[PDB]
């Protein structure tokens, strides 16, 4: 069985405080809605932000949101803040092995 | 609902090539068997090694194995190899939000 390949773009981004930022993920096969988004700050374990494409988890600020279906999904930060500097990942769980996108490093200009 | 907290030990380990290495992960509540193990090399995304406590994924060397149930789980490398140097994490998926242990950094002496 071929793995499902997740393609994330862009691989790095720098923006100013208060700007809007979007990250996309595309799957090589339809995964219906089974996609998660994680945040990882340096030296730390990943933290689940959004479950099943669009369900925001507890303790996550409302300026984060997720959308999409089929093969194409989007992660949005409506107003970038300093504490948001991290690497962000998408992950599919439609089929084993679960795979991650390559990651987007976010930095402030 | 309280989160389920995962406690991983040790947080860091140094060992020689050919040694046996074990990493433990304990949950603050019974998670039955719903625990995954991931490998992460620096600058790279995590890779799923083991699903539902003991099911080894494709492409993974047979020197890796997983065991446990209830609240206590173990990850074993039967013979440490240089390509094994990475950070390893456990993750529960019995309840949302899914949580990770703090990670074990593995290095060679």
Cα separation, A78 vs A30, whole angstroms: 27
Instruction: Tell me whether A101 touches chain B (CB under 8 Å).
Output: yes
Scan residues 48-77 of A and list those with Cβ closer than 8 Å to B.
48, 51, 57-58
Within 8 A of A8 by CB-CB distance, chain B residues are none
> Could you tell me the domains of chain B?
1-109 (2.60.40.10)
Q: Do A103 and B45 touch (CB under 8 A)?
A: yes
Phi, psi for B4 (deg, rounded to 5): -90, 120
Task: Enumerate helices (H) and strands (E) in chain A, giving the number of each.
Answer: 0, 10
Report the alpha-carbon distance of residue B98 to residue B46 in Å, rounded.
15
By the CB < 8 Å criterion, does A2 face chain B? no
Q: Which chain A residues touch B97 with a CB distance below 8 Å?
A: 48, 51, 57-58
CA pair distance B21, B33, nearest whole angstrom:
22
* Three-class SS state of B83: helix
The two structure tokens encoding residue B12: 């860091």
Rg (C-alpha) for chain A, rounded Å, is 13
In angstroms, the first-to-last Cα distance of chain A is 43
Q: Say yes or no for a CB contact (<8 Å) between B100 and A46.
A: yes
Cβ contacts (< 8 Å) between B37 and chain A: which residues?
none
Instruction: Tell me which H or E stretch contains B73.
Output: strand B72-77
Across the interface, which of A47, A89, A96 has its CB nearest the CB of B51?
A96
Report whether A66 contacts A76 (CB < 8 A): yes
- Is the distance from CB of A54 to CB of A104 less than 8 angstroms? no
Phi, psi of B82, rounded to the nearest 5 degrees? -55, -35
Count of residues for chain A?
Answer: 109
Q: Residue B85 has which token pair?
A: 């140097």
CA dihedral A36, B58, B38, A72 (to 10 degrees): -20
CB pair distance less than 8 Å for B97 and A48: yes
Give the A:B interface size as CB pairs under 8 Å: 42
User: By C-alpha distance, which of B66, B1, B72, B61 is closest to B32?
Assistant: B72
Question: Could you give the CA distance from residue A10 to residue A101 in angstroms, rounded to a whole number?
Answer: 11
Q: How far apart are CA B84 and CA B16, in angstroms?
A: 11
Two tokens at B2? 């309280």
Q: Are A86 and A108 in contact (CB under 8 A)?
A: no
| Residues A37 and A75: beta-carbon distance below 8 Å | yes
Angstrom distances, CA of residue A22 to CA of A29, A62, A64: 22, 15, 10
Do residues A98 and A92 lie in contact, with contact meaning Cβ atoms separated by under 8 Å? yes
For B44, other C-beta atoms within 10 Å of its C-beta total 12
């Amino acid at each position: 069985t071929p793995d499902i390949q997740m393609t994330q773009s862009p691989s790095s981004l720098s923006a100013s405080v208060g700007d809007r930022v979007t990250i996309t993920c595309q799957a090589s096969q339809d995964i219906i809605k089974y996609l998660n988004w994680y945040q990882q700050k340096p030296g730390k374990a990943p933290k689940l932000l959004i479950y099943e494409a669009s369900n925001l988890q507890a303790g996550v600020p409302s300026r984060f949101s997720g959308s999409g279906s089929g093969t194409d999904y989007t992660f949005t930060i409506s107003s970038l803040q300093p504490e948001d500097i991290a690497t962000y990942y998408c992950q599919q769980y439609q089929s084993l092995p679960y795979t991650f996108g390559q990651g987007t490093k976010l930095q402030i200009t």
